[PDB]
Each structure stands twice: as structure tokens, then as C-alpha cells.
Amino acid sequence: IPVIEPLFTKVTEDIPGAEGPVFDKNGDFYIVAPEVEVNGKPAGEILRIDLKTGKKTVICKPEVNGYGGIPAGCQCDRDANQLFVADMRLGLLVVQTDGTFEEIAKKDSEGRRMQGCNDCAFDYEGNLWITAPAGEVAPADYTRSMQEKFGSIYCFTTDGQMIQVDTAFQFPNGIAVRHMNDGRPYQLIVAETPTKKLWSYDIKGPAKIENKKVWGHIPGTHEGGADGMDFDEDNNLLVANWGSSHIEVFGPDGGQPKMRIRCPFEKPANLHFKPQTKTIFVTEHENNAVWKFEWQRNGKKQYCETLKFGIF
Numbered sequence: 001i002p003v004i005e006p007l008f009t010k011v012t013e014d015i016p017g018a019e020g021p022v023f024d025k026n027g028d029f030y031i032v033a034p035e036v037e038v039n040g041k042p043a044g045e046i047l048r049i050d051l052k053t054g055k056k057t058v059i060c061k062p063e064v065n066g067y068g069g070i071p072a073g074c075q076c077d078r079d080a081n082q083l084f085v086a087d088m089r090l091g092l093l094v095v096q097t098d099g100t101f102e103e104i105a106k107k108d109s110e111g112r113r114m115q116g117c118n119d120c121a122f123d124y125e126g127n128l129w130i131t132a133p134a135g136e137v138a139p140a141d142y143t144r145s146m147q148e149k150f151g152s153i154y155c156f157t158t159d160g161q162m163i164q165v166d167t168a169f170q171f172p173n174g175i176a177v178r179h180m181n182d183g184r185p186y187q188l189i190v191a192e193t194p195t196k197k198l199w200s201y202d203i204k205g206p207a208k209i210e211n212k213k214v215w216g217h218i219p220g221t222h223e224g225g226a227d228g229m230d231f232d233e234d235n236n237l238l239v240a241n242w243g244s245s246h247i248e249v250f251g252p253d254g255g256q257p258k259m260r261i262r263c264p265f266e267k268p269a270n271l272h273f274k275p276q277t278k279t280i281f282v283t284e285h286e287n288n289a290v291w292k293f294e295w296q297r298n299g300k301k302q303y304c305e306t307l308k309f310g311i312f
């Protein structure tokens, strides 16, 4: 498998468990610090990063009734400049740029207790696909599916329903949606970290997924595996292989990576393209920092880059 070694440029440093890199509608950059804790208790943070200086600004430090959050993944909204944040302790959160936030759900559409989330991905229809590797949200005791298969997948629909679409995963992590050239969502990719697998489903409609399949295989026997992911404009899936020192590049049909990207660190966690560019921002847990490098082409437009009233 061909490996490239692009130049990685330092963006910012010292962010415990640096995760969920994301750009909002105004081009501002955000990162979440899930592993920040106070007195042994979760006290996760959501930060804005000044790309010109690397200076960090904590805009939100979510907590619900004394229970601190563990924000781990983000997606920017289209109709409003707000962030949808997967929180390992609080479920799904909607965070405004002013730092205020709201907890989306304590229970799912079936009345079942909500599970802590890790990452999410908006499809072009506005539906949010979320991975939930943690156990029940606070106030319940914190648990995570690294050893046992109790990780679930959710779809937070346009009509405000939090629907569980699948369960029994051993730490569902990264997640992405593949669209047809005309914009129709048709495939969901879900990373299952410890098992070194990438799972796929056919998206038949909002919160409707069928034909679960082992779509891709993540290299290595190291502890870790597929973490964050995103598609480039040609629908190549770039996957952060935590603990392998590489970002795997899968072709449209999956299977084995068709290319690997060597990182100057052992633990790449998550990534995100800068709108209209080939620039990919990467967070890593060896140094707990954020970097950037140039990929071969532009990223696939995120939902926040599309237009609700666009003609084409």
C-alpha cells in the first residue's frame, strides 16, 4: 500500500484529548477537549482556535446539574451557525458561538435512556447520524463499550426525533455519510475502533438504514484503530487510525486502504477539511495537539456548506 508523508504544520497545542475539529459557517475553527477534568471529575471543554496565532479560547464548558461533559465530536449546522456536539456524558448538545448550549435529549424516541455520544455526521437532508459508544448519559455512572458490545448508533432527524438505528457495537467511533452526485444520501460508514473494522449500511431514508456490512479493514494489531473520518470530494474516505501513526485512505468501494498517510505522531484522533481547500486539520493524542497538512484534493462539502435555498 503506497504511503505519502505530507508536511504537517502545528496549529495549536495542549488540548487534552483534542477532538472534534470543525469549521462553522463563518470559517471559524473549533476543537473539543473531552479529557479535561477537575478533581477527577469530567470538565470537558469546547474551544475556538485563532488560526493565525494558535491561541485557544474556551467558549463552553458544558455541565448539566453538576455533571461535567465529555464533548468529543462536532458538526456545524446549515440553517443556523451553531454546533451539534456529541458528548460522552451528556449525549447530543447544540452549542451557540456565544458559548451557551442546550442538551438535546435524555431519552430516545422509544423512551429508552440516552447514551453518551462520540462523533456525528450530518447528511445533505439535515439528518444527524451519531455514534454512541458510552453507556447511559449522566447522572448514570460512566461506562464505555471498549470491551463489551453496548455501543449504539442514532439518527437525530429534522423533525426532532432521536432514533436509535442500531446497537451492539464495540465502541462505535467515527462516522460519515456518502452521497450520490445529485446529493442523495445512500451510505453510512461507522468506525468500530477495537475490532479494526469500518461498517456500512444503505441509507434508505431519514433514520432508515439496512444491510449492515463489514465495509473496510483497518491495518494493525496495536491498541486503537479507526477513530475520526471524512470524505474528500472524490468520495475517498480518510480515516484516523489511532495508534498506527497513519491516516488510512479508502477508495469509494472500501475494502483495504488504497493509500496511507504517515503522521509525525502515533495517535491521530480526528480530522476535518477547511472549506474550499485541500487542507486537513488533524488532532492527535500523543502530544494532544492540532496539526494541518495538504491532501491531494478538496474535501467533500459538509452539510453546513450547502444551501437550503440553492437552485443547483
Ligand SMILES: [Ca+2]
Residues within 6 Å of the ligand: 019, 072, 073, 118, 119, 173, 174, 227, 228, 269, 270
Ligand atoms: Ca472520536
Ligand SMILES: [Ca+2]
Residues within 6 Å of the ligand: 021, 228, 229, 230, 270, 271, 272, 273
Ligand atoms: Ca471531521
